[model samples]
Target: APDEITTAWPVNVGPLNPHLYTPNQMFAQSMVYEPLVKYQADGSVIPWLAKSWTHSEDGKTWTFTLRDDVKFSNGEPFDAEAAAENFRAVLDNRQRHAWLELANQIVDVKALSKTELQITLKSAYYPFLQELALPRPFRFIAPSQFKNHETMNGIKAPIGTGPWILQESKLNQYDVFVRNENYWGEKPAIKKITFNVIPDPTTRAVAFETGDIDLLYGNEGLLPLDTFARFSQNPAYHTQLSQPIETVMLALNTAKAPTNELAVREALNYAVNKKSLIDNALYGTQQVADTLFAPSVPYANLGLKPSQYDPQKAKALLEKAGWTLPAGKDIREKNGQPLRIELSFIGTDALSKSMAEIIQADMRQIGADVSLIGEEESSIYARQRDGRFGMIFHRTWGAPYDPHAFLSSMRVPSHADFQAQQGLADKPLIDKEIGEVLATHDETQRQALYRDILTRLHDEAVYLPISYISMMVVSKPELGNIPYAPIATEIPFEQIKP
Candidate 1:
């Protein structure tokens, strides 16, 4: 019998290789692609495509031996050359790659032979192995299939050795996958999986309610806690909750006026009530956060506290910064200049738009003039990269199994440095600590390093950590063994079945 499952999100299996895939798109592809290394449900590393691997005594070099039986979906051989070429392709064309910033730790990759490969890093990076387990481009690809096709579009019709194969995909419409019967590992029990993309949250919820889709990813429509509880209580369905890897944050452009003052930044932090927002607006679905790093990651600093929400303290800081409230309005003026800054947001993301409204209202209470402007996601990110916006509402990737990959990328000294000289470059000590943590796997040392870095980040007041959002999915009871490891970046496809 052919089992089938349906989802609300549409999949666009575009021409880009898995390496350059966007976050949501990569999640869509994880169902059919397999990485060389696989992580267990308990966050431990295990073998997948590569049968085994070993690291050098210094931990700078790693050698992986491929499984002789591994083959691409099209029956092409998967070998060491393919593994090395994939990494090279990612490093060479990182600008277009969605998570290319995470690949910077790799110094070089060499194919020792058809069945063996070696990876050398510029430093003894402890997180390199976990990085290899990341899906898509971070996952291995056959060199022969992609060597002649240098462009990402060449692999849009993906050919991979996994439990499922891409049967059909139409942009912004739907994606269909057929089970691979000859899968090397446990095969998917379901014969077909269909992803139906529904952009509007309300419509998605309607579809879920009508049984048009089997799973609803995330909290579609930001349903109330009571509503969610009622939905879970019904014997007709079931829902699972867990901490997600990403952080919802307000990225400050320190180079902008009004916000350029450290006192103002701190004042803004005090004025906003994250706890209240989480309770009232988000229905307590998220965890309040103080640092960019989540509690699930290794070396996470659990003791750091977020800024206290005190309107009085915010007013005092504004006064101390020489800003005074205008005659009768909720506006402040400093040295004859009005304290006004543009708070840019992506109009398309309903959650972001709501968050921007909440923050805009909160900042107004502190006499700061915030003008909310909605633009396309690309435009908003462009302004953020250029340091043009005063503050931007955004979320950073987590669940890469390594903190350095995501955390370092946001620091000014990392990839964003080429665009603006603003971020972690402003704090050399914090930058050094991050580097120290990433270069070694010493648990104690890494934890201390993260503590110091997060502490300094809090004190700097550059990024305001709002909350940790969960990745929710609503699936039929028939879907069994769906791996939902709190720290996992991608869902394990091999174990998922209906």
Candidate 2:
């Protein structure tokens, strides 16, 4: 008990399968699974499962030299064969991993020797290493853990070569992880970790304060801003915030009416008071953002001015677009149609709900009829994928994935970003530029491509940039070495101490 740490996961940890992309938290898998490389918070990558690697001149083929001595918690040797098989399992179910560019680019994988592995790709994918560094789908599990030699359905167990192993789990209650005695790297002094599932935000913070839960980390209002502000001033706990991790913004559906108009989109951007929204609704816990990607992210820091709040300007633009408020009417109308908009958000998320309510009121002040549709996360996701709403919340996937994977996802027809930009006059050209940006190896050419792509999106007013979200950590005062994760989706549990 003395060597144990307690934490909170806002949702279920899922089936604990390393290769399964959805239905699981990335950090939960990170405890027992490991990637070939580790992405640093600063966008650099370092060696992990693979000691070192080399690629062909064309970048189509790669060879990785793995550590000589490593074993899974289930006693299977973690050799080149194990590594090759782990990848093939994912390749077998290629459709599930279509969102990741590396999955589609990869062609073949083979074990060169006991310590070396070779992989051939369809073409040069520059983000190959970074994609492997992700917390999921690319990580490895023991070959013996697979059921029927496949990971699509499920796994026999959550066995891997990482520092901790899942020992026990109770649905909606908690999960227990014990240190892997066979870990080849630095073993933490904390031998055990219990992740309590407290879905409610207020209850989660209460558990941390009452000594029931030892730490709070990650997003989705893990520690609500009001509570985080209180904990920062309190001497009993430690509160840390990382650099702006990603941008929180709303995507206006270009395929739909009203928002399909450029003037209407620009008016919506000017209607919201970002500074006031952050100060009042977010408790001044986040930085106001006027761009889709934070300045910290690579190729995102273009010298752009903040989208200042001007309700009068918003009204003027809408009037120019032919939507006018009549003498006795409360809402604006154009051609006998009211200027109505449907804002969609995840109903269970307090943060989303708060922002939606505030934005609804803000839009109404500018004579726009705003309606709130708070639905389940699944419903909201479906809406985003299908372009079923006039406006929906969208956040960038933080570091290592931003500017590359995030931009890449925008071209896929199933993604909301692609659907939202469907009405753009040069949608095909924008998509083509994104493809060029990903494949270009020359730094100068890539930078130029990204500049054009991001600038065009910013000028089109397709997104109403809200604020920059940073990772927040709240833990006991004595818990040292509280490192921020390279990506906001994970937590560095192994690096922290009791």
Candidate 3:
């Protein structure tokens, strides 16, 4: 039985293209490709194929010594030139990777020798190694797989130096992988792995309960909150809840109308009791979010607290913003114009709908007209970019260890719409520290910059933190070496054994 393991997955992996940013696809990508460095269980970086590295005097240049034993599944050499090729491909496709905005930092990638690779940057970015460690589009592919201007990469087949090789793949169906006999590193515990894509949450829960699947994984809709609770007393499965790093917030369009006014924004924050919202909505299962970086994040602002919910204080702020509740109407008005708010969210998401309803009631007490609307993701994004709505609930991926990717995302302004991070202002000091954090490899110096950047966000108050996301998982008690972290499980698929 060690030769095979069957598990449930999220949804359609969208053609299994590693380079293309596909939704519901990371489950397969992580099993097939390997980053140069592996992020260990403790949230630290370690050598995978990379042996060692050093930075130039000014910290703008980096040279890496790669392992000589590695080779792609297709028999291509995994050398310095191949490493350079992968990064060059990344640079060419940086527009698709605008989330990190890292391509601008990479000036050039050079192969000095088969075992040595050097990367030139416009400036020092200490998190370059960490950024390169991203498991997504940054996952290292074989040089032969590289194509110039190829929009759809990874559509053919996977051929990385990973411990597993892609054996079977198809759309709207399951995918399978077999252990690589010629893997450069330790042998995988399981010889064959299978992923069954189950879209329905109830069916997925039943699959685990009926022994059709060996384990279950968490996702946005596929894994409901009540699934783990249903199996808590069962001897066959064990439930694991990770520390929350997933953050929920509302992106107020500060570039327009009432939201542009700081008083109105602060008033919105003061009107809602976040604890009540989370406790009631999620049944007190999740923790309240006070700051952007959770406690698990390195150099997080632990001292900060969320804005208090006070209807009286909210009314005072509204009055200060020149809005007053008239005798005849419940809504606040200024110069005969009522304060109307239209908040948009994905129609199908139950949690989003619930959050909007609870907050709508809270805003009503403060004399604000709240209109709740539901739409598709494409429509919601269209409105967010055009500034068509007042606010939209938002969630992002960075967690405990990705300051390298997260901070740059906030500073560079690369996102479609400014999702409550950086917008409509200038901060020379915070911007300076972002560059410094990139330049200096010292943890102490980086910590100082994180403090500065976080402090600035708190004062600016563009986003209201709702709940710190805690991922839930339930698996057979027989399964071992299952890792848990803030965002997702860090356990390499090969390491998971039964």
Best by lDDT: 2
Better of 1 and 3 by lDDT: 3
Better candidate by TM-score, 1 or 2 = 2
Q: Estimate TM-scores for all models.
A: 0.89, 0.97, 0.90
Off by over 4 Å in 2: none
lDDT by residue for model 1 over 206-270, one digit each (tens)?
67778888776553233334456566777777666565657777777666687778888889888
Candidate ranking (TM-score, best to worst): 2, 3, 1
Lowest lDDT 10-residue stretch of candidate 3: 414-423
Off by over 4 Å in 1: 41-43, 94-102, 147-153, 219-230, 233-235, 411-425, 441-445, 477-489
Q: What TM-score, to 2 decimals, does candidate 2 have?
A: 0.97
Clashes of each: 5, 0, 1
lDDT-sorted candidate list, best first: 2, 3, 1
- Expressed as tens digits, the lDDT of each residue in 1-498 for candidate 2 is 667888888777877899886678788898889988888876778998899999999989999999988889888899999999999999898997877888999999999998999989988888889999998898898888888999887898888999988989888888888888889999978889898999888998899989998788876377688988999999888988877778899999888988999999999999999989998889988888888887767987787655689999999999999999988987899999999999999998888899998898899999898889999989998998889989999898887789899998888888889989999998899999988887789999898988889988988888999999888888887776488777667777777765
